[PDB]
């Protein structure tokens, strides 16, 4: 009786071989497990098919004359208030719209053939409330707008899966910023003031370092007894480390020297080197002891896995 015709979106339509009682051809398709039917002046698979869901929603499939596009609309039982609309082309691009109870646009998804995409959400006044743009390389930007139409949050994801999240205040200033590195470690800046100062945390494998942000740098601080270890991160991401001890006894006071070339802090007590702390390219810290003479490293460097081990190194 029928001939199967391939359509966009992997859809198929069955068409009658020869026109019915009038000059019309019969059409049947199943879309999302609902069987739709209609008739057409034409013989190629094009035309309009309709069905009704179990909840009385009306479904209308329009296949373009040249078979290059399908439009699938879902309406309320009135047959005219839109619930959703999906348009799909032979090149695999599509647009999908969702509507509110009044049949006004509430969400729109555009998917391109190269897999880039856009998503927009609109509020009850039809104003943009969210926008999410994804590029062909899978990087993306997601913005949320408040009721004043101003940017409230922004999340940027890069192709290498690093990302930045920013919250904005009523002055349009960044009030919080979370940076995830490509290795999964994180910087968290909170309570950021108009001078660009705020609280800072660095979230590492096994421990979190805490400190402050100023225009000049991020400074993360670990204290143990009278010793303060400070890890500085410059605006371009350069790490330097310093140590200060208020101990006044030659027997026990720590001092330290930083070698930028080897990213190593060498600690000395009573004119003898005691240990090297290496701040590695993997965002880890290793510790290695010197011999009793204070001149040669012994054993192997050991990776720090908890904050108490950093404090132990400072004792």
> Identical fold at 78-216 and 217-315?
yes
Q: Which long-range contacts (CB under 8 A, 24 or more apart) does 222-231 make?
A: 222/307, 222/310, 222/311, 222/314, 223/314, 224/311, 224/312, 224/314, 224/315, 225/314, 225/315, 227/254, 227/314, 227/315, 229/265, 229/310, 229/314, 231/202, 231/279
3 state SS of 42 = coil
In sequence order, what are the beta bridge partners of 203? 186, 208
Domain boundaries, the chain: 1-77, 78-216, 217-315
Distance CA(227)–CA(129), nearest Å, equals 50
CATH 3.90.930.1 fits 217-315, yes or no: yes
Whole-angstrom CA distances from 40 to 5, 14, 44, 72, 246 are: 14, 12, 9, 17, 91
DSSP 166-216: EEE-TTS-EEEEEEE-TTS-EEEEES--TTS-EEEEEEETTEEEEEEE-SS
Cβ atoms 51, 57 nearer than 8 A: no
Asked whether 206 and 305 are in contact (CB, 8 A), the reply is yes
Helix, strand, coil % in the chain, rounded to nearest 5: 5, 55, 40
What topology is assigned to 1-77 in CATH? Lipocalin (2.40.128)
DSSP state letter for 33: T
Buried b (16+ CB within 10 A) or exposed e, 286-307: bbbbbeeeeeeeeeebeebeee
CA distance 227 to 237: 25
Those residues whose C-beta lies under 8 Å from the C-beta of residue 249, and which sit 6 or more positions away, are none
Cα–Cα distance, 257 to 264 (Å, whole number) = 8
The separation between CA 252 and the C-alpha centre of its own chain, rounded to angstroms, equals 49
Instruction: Extract the runs of DSSP E, i.e. beta strands, from 7-127.
Output: 12-16, 25-31, 34-40, 47-52, 58-63, 69-75, 82-89, 94-99, 105-111, 117-122
Cα–Cα distance list, 201 to 176, 214, 239 (Å): 12, 13, 15
DSSP 71: E
Would you call 313 helix, strand, or coil by DSSP? helix
- What are the structure tokens assigned to 270, written together? 């009573």
Diameter over CA atoms, the chain: 110
Number of H helices, E strands in the chain: 1, 27
- Kindly give, in sequence order, each residue whose CB lies less than 8 Å from that of residue 34, ignoring residues fewer than 6 positions away: 51, 53, 59
CB of 57 within 8 A of CB of 80?
Answer: no
Q: Does the domain formed by 78-216 have CATH 3.90.930.1?
A: yes
β 285-289/34-40 pair status: unpaired
Reduced to 3 states (helix: H, G, I; strand: E, B; else coil), residue 311 is helix
Q: Measured between alpha carbons, how far is 104 from 124 in angstroms, rounded to an integer?
A: 9
Given a contact cutoff of 8 angstroms between Cβ atoms, the answer to whether 85 and 73 are in contact is yes
Bridge partners, residue 145, by sequence: 151
Find tokens 């039917």 and name the residue. 37
CA-to-CA distance for 300 and 283, rounded, in angstroms?
18
Q: Which two tokens stand for residue 234?
A: 């410059």
- Report the chain's terminal Cα–Cα distance, integer Å: 89
Phi then psi for 232, rounded to 5 degrees? Answer: -105, 140
Six-digit token string for 276 = 């090297």
Beta pairing class for 302-303 and 174-180: unpaired
Structural determination approach: X-ray
């Amino acid at each position: 009786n029928s001939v199967s015709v391939d359509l966009p979106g992997s859809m198929k339509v069955l068409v009658s071989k020869s026109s019915n009682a009038d000059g019309k051809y019969d059409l049947i398709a199943t879309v999302d497990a609902l069987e739709l039917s209609g008739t057409s002046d034409k013989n190629n698979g094009s035309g309009v098919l309709e069905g009704v869901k179990a909840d009385a929603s009306k479904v209308k499939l329009t296949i373009s004359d040249d078979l290059g596009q399908t439009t699938l609309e879902v309406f309320k039982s009135d047959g005219s208030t839109l619930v959703s609309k999906k348009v799909t082309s032979k090149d695999k691009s599509s647009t999908y719209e969702k509507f509110n109870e009044k049949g006004e646009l509430s969400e729109k998804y555009i998917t391109r053939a190269d897999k880039s995409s856009t998503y927009e959400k609109f509020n009850e006044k039809g104003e943009l409330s969210e926008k999410y743009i994804t590029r062909a390389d899978k990087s993306s930007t997601y913005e949320k707008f408040n009721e004043k139409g101003e940017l409230s949050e922004k999340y940027i994801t890069r192709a290498d899966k690093s990302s930045t999240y920013e919250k904005f205040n009523e002055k349009g200033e960044v009030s919080e910023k979370y940076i995830t590195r490509a290795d999964g470690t994180r910087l968290e800046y909170t309570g950021i003031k108009s001078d660009g100062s705020g609280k800072a945390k660095e979230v590492l494998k096994g421990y979190v370092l805490e400190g402050t942000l100023t225009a000049e740098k991020t400074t993360l601080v670990v204290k143990e007894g009278t010793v303060t270890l400070s890890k500085n991160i410059s605006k371009s991401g350069e790490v330097s480390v310093e140590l200060n001890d208020t101990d006044s006894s030659a027997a026990t006071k720590k001092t330290a020297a930083w070698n930028s070339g080897t990213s190593t802090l060498t600690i000395t007590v009573n004119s003898k080197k005691t240990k090297d702390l290496v701040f590695t390219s993997s965002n880890t810290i290793t510790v290695q002891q010197y011999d009793s003479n204070g001149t040669s490293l012994e054993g192997s460097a050991v990776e720090i896995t908890k904050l108490d081990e950093i404090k132990n190194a400072l004792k």
